[PDB]
Amino acid sequence: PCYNQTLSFTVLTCIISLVGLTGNAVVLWLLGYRMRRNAVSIYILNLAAADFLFLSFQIIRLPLRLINISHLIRKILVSVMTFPYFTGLSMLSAISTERCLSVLWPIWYRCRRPTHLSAVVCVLLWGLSLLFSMLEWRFCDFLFSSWCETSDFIPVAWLIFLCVVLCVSSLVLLVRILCGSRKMPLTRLYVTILLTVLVFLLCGLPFGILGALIYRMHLNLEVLYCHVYLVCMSLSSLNSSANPIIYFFVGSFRQ
Numbered sequence: 362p363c364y365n366q367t368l369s370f371t372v373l374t375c376i377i378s379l380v381g382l383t384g385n386a387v388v389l390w391l392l393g394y395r396m397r398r399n400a401v402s403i404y405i406l407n408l409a410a411a412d413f414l415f416l417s418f419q420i421i422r423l424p425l426r427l428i429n430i431s432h433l434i435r436k437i438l439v440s441v442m443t444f445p446y447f448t449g450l451s452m453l454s455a456i457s458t459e460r461c462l463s464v465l466w467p468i469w470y471r472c473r474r475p476t477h478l479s480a481v482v483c484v485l486l487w488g489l490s491l492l493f494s495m496l497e498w499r500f501c502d503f504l505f506s507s508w509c510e511t512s513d514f515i516p517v518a519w520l521i522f523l524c525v526v527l528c529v530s531s532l533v534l535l536v537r538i539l540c541g542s543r544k545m546p547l548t549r550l551y552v553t554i555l556l557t558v559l560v561f562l563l564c565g566l567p568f569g570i571l572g573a574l575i576y577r578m579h580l581n582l583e584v585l586y587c588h589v590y591l592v593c594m595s596l597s598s599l600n601s602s603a604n605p606i607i608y609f610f611v612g613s614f615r616q
């Protein structure tokens with residue numbers, strides 16, 4: 362904490378996290394058994410599970426900032442929490458590109474899909490989220506040699522690839538929709554895509570870019586960067602909290 366203005370910030374973070382696990386738990390309970398796992402609901406299911414892990418780790422992390430400062434276990438929690446965050450961003454990107462592919466070629470999607478590619482790509486995303494967690498961890502990495510000592514920007518490359526592929530998938534979906542017959546439910550489609558892109562860039566992505574440029578330039582959080590880290594953490598928490606809403610509750614409450 363800089364001097365003050367931290368207790369209310371972590372209280373807001375904790376409340377947002379509480380509603381986050383509430384929503385993630387209800388959506389996980391509904392989709393786990395009261396669902397059919399058609400083609401994308403698997404993505405929503407495991408994304409909601411990873412998000413539940415996220416907000417749970419948030420409620421584990423924040424209340425220890427005010428009492429019993431330790432400065433080491435904190436690094437451990439942010440290090441481990443990097444993995445569920447990467448998983449959640451990967452699942453958001455996968456959902457976006459998967460919807461884009463479904464719209465681009467619907468016949469292939471509905472007929473010629475292997476009907477198990479969802480699980481395969483899900484486990485590949487989880488495995489690659491196990492990887493790329495060694496951005497800041499330049500600690501005893503060389504256990505043997507050709508390894509980027511300090512300027513290791515491969516996880517940054519993965520994150521920027523995820524962001525750009527999500528953006529290009531949304532753009533291609535919009536171009537395909539706007540270059541065809543206008544059935545004109547073209548207000549629900551506008552709002553959902555705009556909301557997903559906005560909640561990915563304005564929220565969530567700030568946490569990733571914060572980690573990226575905080576381990577690229579080794580900043581000790583000084584007293585100048587103890588006010589923006591809280592904002593980034595709460596933005597990521599709110600993104601993870603509202604993530605189940607947009608993808609499941611909007612559809613469920615539509616009828």
Ligand SMILES: C[C@H](CCC(=O)O)[C@H]1CC[C@H]2[C@@H]3CC[C@@H]4C[C@H](OP(=O)(O)O)CC[C@]4(C)[C@H]3C[C@H](O)[C@]12C
Nearest residue numbers: 432435436439440443496516517568569571572573
């Ligand atoms: C998501 C990114 C990595 C993603 C990436 O770039 O590929 C994660 C990785 C390690 C995380 C930082 C480690 C400790 C940083 C310093 C402080 O640590 P505390 O004692 O807990 O207050 C605050 C947390 C802190 C600002 C974390 C911010 C950010 O979330 C990081 C860098």
